[PDB]
């Protein structure tokens, strides 16, 4: 969360927490209801978001669903949607955390190495999280869409 990051910052600088970041933790504390609402709406409509985003990705980039591509077949397309499920789950975790660090710890360290191993094109995954971002911000109200799009934007930035 923001509190662990402020604590490791005050630890490496070997001082107490500044009143600026105490005010940051307090503002995060008061904005908990808005982030709960955002993560609530995202956990509500995860299937519709995944279905529309996967069909938009397959319409945009057909190389993955082509023969010889990565996600070819029923189980491979289902595993592709499972990976999109994991990434939307980490998006909700980072949305409720107030920080991008659980998304970093769980699903951003070695995604290039492991997708080099599996053969998955990583830019296709960046396009998938782009479509998930466009659909989820299409669902939300514009201010909350900006908040969720910050974390989605961070994920596609760490992808490509």
């Amino acid at each position: 969360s923001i509190v662990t990051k402020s604590i490791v910052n005050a630890d490496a600088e070997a001082r107490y927490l500044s009143p600026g970041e105490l005010d940051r933790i307090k503002a995060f504390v008061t904005s908990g209801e808005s982030r709960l609402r955002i993560a609530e709406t995202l956990t509500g409509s995860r299937e519709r978001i995944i279905k529309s985003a996967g069909d938009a990705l397959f319409q945009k980039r057909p190389d993955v669903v082509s023969p010889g591509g990565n996600a070819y077949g029923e189980e491979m397309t289902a595993t592709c949607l499972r990976d999109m499920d994991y990434y939307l789950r980490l998006i909700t975790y980072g949305v409720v955390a107030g920080d991008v660090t659980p998304i970093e710890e769980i699903g951003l360290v070695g995604v290039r190495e492991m997708y080099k191993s599996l053969g998955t094109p990583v830019d296709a995954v960046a396009q998938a999280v782009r479509e998930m971002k466009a659909v989820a911000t299409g669902m939300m109200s514009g201010d909350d869409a900006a908040e969720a799009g910050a974390y989605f934007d961070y994920v596609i930035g760490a992808m490509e």
Partner: protein, 161 residues
């Protein structure tokens, strides 16, 4: 390094489920504690030097340690002692803010035991000094946050002993 939030997310992540209502219950528990956690943290950050000097004046000053023959005799050892106490108080404040003693097990009590055995530091005097610091900060910042600091100081003592 995990908060109450990061430990909740971690526990829901190992078993593999999404956020359930009981996780939201723990999260709202953390927030309604966290407001007064912030005010107590500001109070401790304001008065840390007086807290440490009252802790050593309570327990360590007129004993054999601050006297000759103890491990607190020289000015080198006294400065190291005050630095050790300041670090205990600072990491207790971090654990109070995070709502989780994982930082105390991660950064404080990692190899502190064996260097305290190897340098010959008395564990009992340190534990007395930490408990004196505990009720000093309890009388300073209040009752409920005094209990908050109390379980984290007790976590440091249990990892030390």
């Amino acid at each position: 390094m995990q908060d109450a939030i990061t430990s909740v997310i971690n526990s829901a992540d190992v078993q593999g489920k999404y956020l359930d209502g009981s996780a939201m219950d723990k999260l709202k528990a953390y927030f309604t504690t966290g407001a007064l956690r912030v005010r107590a943290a500001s109070t401790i950050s304001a008065n840390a030097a007086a807290i440490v000097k009252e802790a050593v004046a309570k327990s360590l000053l007129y004993s054999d340690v601050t006297r000759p023959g103890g491990n607190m005799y020289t000015t080198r050892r006294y400065a190291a002692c005050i630095r050790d106490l300041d670090y205990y108080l600072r990491y207790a404040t971090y654990a109070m803010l995070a709502g989780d003693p994982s930082i105390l097990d991660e950064r404080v009590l990692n190899g502190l035991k064996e260097t305290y055995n190897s340098l010959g530091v008395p564990v009992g005097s340190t534990v007395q000094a930490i408990q004196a610091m505990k009720e000093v900060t309890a009388g300073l910042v209040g009752a409920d946050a005094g209990r908050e600091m109390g379980v984290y100081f007790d976590y440091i003592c249990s990892g030390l002993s």
